[PDB]
Amino acid sequence: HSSGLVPRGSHMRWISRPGWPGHLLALAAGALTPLALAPFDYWPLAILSIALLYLGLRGLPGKSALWRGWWYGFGAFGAGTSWIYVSIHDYGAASVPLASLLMLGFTAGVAFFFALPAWLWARCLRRDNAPLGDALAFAALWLALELFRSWFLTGFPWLYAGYSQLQGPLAGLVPVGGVWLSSFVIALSAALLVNLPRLFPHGASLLLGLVLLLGPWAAGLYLKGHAWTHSAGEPLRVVAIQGNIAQELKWDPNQVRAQLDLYRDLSLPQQDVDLIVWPETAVPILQDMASGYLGAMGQVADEKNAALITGVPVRERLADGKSRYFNGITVVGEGAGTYLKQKLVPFGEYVPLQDLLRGLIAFFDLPMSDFARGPADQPLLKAKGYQIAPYICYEVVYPEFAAALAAQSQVLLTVSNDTWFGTSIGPLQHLQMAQMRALESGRWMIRATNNGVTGLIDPYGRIVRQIPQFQQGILRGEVIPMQGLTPYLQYRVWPLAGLAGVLLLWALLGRQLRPQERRL
Ligand SMILES: CCCCCCCC/C=C\CCCCCCCC(=O)OC[C@H](O)CO
Ligand SMILES: CCCCCCCC/C=C\CCCCCCCC(=O)OC[C@H](O)CO
Ligand SMILES: CCCCCCCC/C=C\CCCCCCCC(=O)OC[C@H](O)CO
Ligand SMILES: CCCCCCCC/C=C\CCCCCCCC(=O)OC[C@H](O)CO
Ligand SMILES: *C(=S)NCCCCCCCCCCCCC
């Protein structure tokens, strides 16, 4: 049998005990997670962060476990996504005290994405006396935890631990089970290293712990660089245009026309290529009222035997009066199709509780928007006879959602505007998650940005071609259409999710099961 409590005199009990020291370690532990992500990319920190949290929950009761999970999550988001403050301050025009209070509220609320599972772990799931089962149960809890984060309210799938393995040794597992399997193995390892000393007395158990600990790592390295997809056709020559049109939230007539003339003038001279791509809302005019600018741009592409792909605000006139808006992208030239954004950022593209909050937002002079969600099932964009999966801005962040469109495609395309966050680590984290989509999908991704990290991503998630951010530039490069299905795109989460459900159900039942001192 095993208690698990560290022997007295080791200076390690405060970690797993109720009180402020254990919470402060958890706060710092959570703050490691951005370190393991881009741009720092110290991926072993991801294991340490989770290992520290797992250890800090060992003896803990439910009420203090909940708050210790809140402190961990507060450190993760307070350090990992605090960069959201830049958009609110610099482009929302809010003062620093105001913007600080908003971000303080946000990360304190978002920190409950780690508080709730911690509380669930303590009250119902944790088995301190079974080291091997506890590690599996914790890993399977980590999956549920991130899966829940993708779904709840609108979802905030930021800082998944799995993204640290994009260029890490576990990159071989990402095409197999997605970012989900990557997070699962990082948590599983982290709990095994904690409980590994407890298996030293026992040979067979320790051996089994070592296979579970290092087996998947070996499997990830063995599968690193393996191509599950095959060439579908001749390479496409791609030109992406990055015009640092200063974001003006008050959108004014004289700067609009200079946008239309900037993107045109930059496209014409480019010697013939297969694809011209423009970033998010590259043409600022509504789709219906830009027939002239759009129509001319198609013939310019036609003379260049090319397809032009650009983001454009799209309007829908209802039967009664006023319109409805969408953040769309459309294709002209050698191609067709128009895609409408489905995932909308709350408080950026729309107001989630507009009736109460509208007046409140207005008194503090905060920007508001009224974009609407795209339909459930939309066709893919067509360009030179190929199926191009479209992603606008942070739709790339939702892995299950991305996989549905990534399948049934031969190339991946995203246009996004990272201007809002400036020189912070947001755009790099955002970009990193875009590369994971290429690695899960075994497809090339074209990423054109209004100003931040435009590039071409090979099917291994590696950035083969890119241009400097924060300056006007053009990216010339070649991407290859891809055929075939990765295992992750074939089966998605369900194989791993079912395994996790079993492990959670086992732990839940096994925690309360009589250990062969049966009453019957
Ligand atoms: C003591 C138990 C033994 C275990 C080993 C020691 C554990 C503590 C080690 C490091 C935590 C301190 C890290 C401080 C928090 C990370 C720094 C940070 O958050 O920087 C992110 C930055 O804000 C992005 O812009
Ligand atoms: C910085 C916070 C200090 C707290 C740490 C105290 C205990 C360290 C625990 C485990 C090893 C983590 C150290 C790993 C060093 C970084 C990993 C690395 O070398 O990555 C290279 C980089 O990713 C190329 O881009
Ligand atoms: C979801 C968005 C958040 C909505 C609200 C979520 C729950 C808020 C509960 C209390 C708020 C004020 C907390 C006051 C501090 C509570 C301290 C406490 O309970 O400590 C117990 C101790 O840790 C055990 O030993
Ligand atoms: C370990 C402690 C973790 C918690 C930390 C505090 C969390 C409090 C919440 C919001 C603070 C609002 C201020 C956020 C300031 C971030 C500013 C920022 O990241 O800007 C990047 C800059 O542009 C790069 O050049
Ligand atoms: C294009 S949309 N890129 C912008 C990325 C914005 C990141 C900000 C995310 C804020 C989401 C909060 C939702 C809260 C859910 C509970």
Specify the CATH number of the domain 230-491.
3.60.110.10
Resolution in A: 2.6
Quick check: CB of 441 below 6 Å from ligand 5? Answer: no
Quick check: CB of 167 below 6 Å from ligand 2? Answer: no
Q: Which amino acid is at 285?
A: I
- State residue 276 phi and psi, 5-degree precision: -110, 125
Cβ neighbours, 10 Å, residue 354: 12
**N- to C-terminal Cα distance for the chain?**
22
- Sign of the Cα torsion 307, 308, 313, 315 reads negative
- Sign of the Cα torsion 51, 52, 53, 56 reads positive
Sheet strand arrangement including 473-479: 338-340, 325-333, 307-315, 275-277, 236-242, 473-479
Cβ neighbours, 10 Å, residue 391: 28
Report the structure determination method. X-ray
Between the CA of 413 and the centroid of ligand 5 the distance, in Å, is 20
Is residue 166 a contact partner of residue 151, using CB atoms and an 8 Å limit? Answer: no
Cα(251)–Cα(62) distance, integer angstroms: 51
Give whole-number Cα distances, 144 to 50, 178, 246, 288, in Å: 15, 14, 41, 44
- Sign of the Cα torsion 381, 154, 397, 186 reads negative
Quick check: CB of 40 below 6 Å from ligand 2? Answer: no
Give helix then strand counts, H and E, for the chain: 17, 15
Cβ neighbours, 10 Å, residue 273: 18
Residue 301 has what DSSP assignment?
H
- Sign of the Cα torsion 320, 322, 328, 334 reads positive
Cα(489)–Cα(497) distance, integer angstroms: 14
Query: Where does residue 93 fall: left (phi above 0), alpha (psi -120 to 50 degrees), or beta otherwise?
Result: left
Between the CA of 158 and the centroid of ligand 5 the distance, in Å, is 8
Of 10, 7, 117, the closest CA to residue 53 belongs to: 117
Of 216, 136, 148, 230, the closest CA to residue 176 belongs to: 216
Residue 371 has what DSSP assignment?
B
Classify strands 307-315 and 325-333 as parallel, antiparallel or unpaired: antiparallel
b vs e for 251-260, b when ≥16 Cβ sit within 10 Å of the residue's Cβ?
eeeeeeeebb
Of 343, 372, 347, the closest CA to residue 155 belongs to: 343
HSE-up of 441 (CA within 13 Å, CB side)?
Answer: 34
- State residue 91 phi and psi, 5-degree precision: -105, -25
Q: What angle do CA 104, 90, 111 make, to 5 degrees?
A: 20
Is residue 215 a contact partner of residue 254, using CB atoms and an 8 Å limit? Answer: no
Cα(326)–Cα(369) distance, integer angstroms: 11
393 is catalytic: yes
Helix (H) or strand (E) holding 202: none
280 is catalytic: yes
Quick check: CB of 109 below 6 Å from ligand 5? Answer: no
Is residue 436 a contact partner of residue 177, using CB atoms and an 8 Å limit? Answer: no
The secondary structure of 206-273 as a DSSP string is: HHHHHHHHHHHHHHHHHHTT----EE-SSPEEEEEEE------SS--HHHHHHHHHHHHHHHTTSPS-
- Helical segments of 271-329, H only: 291-303
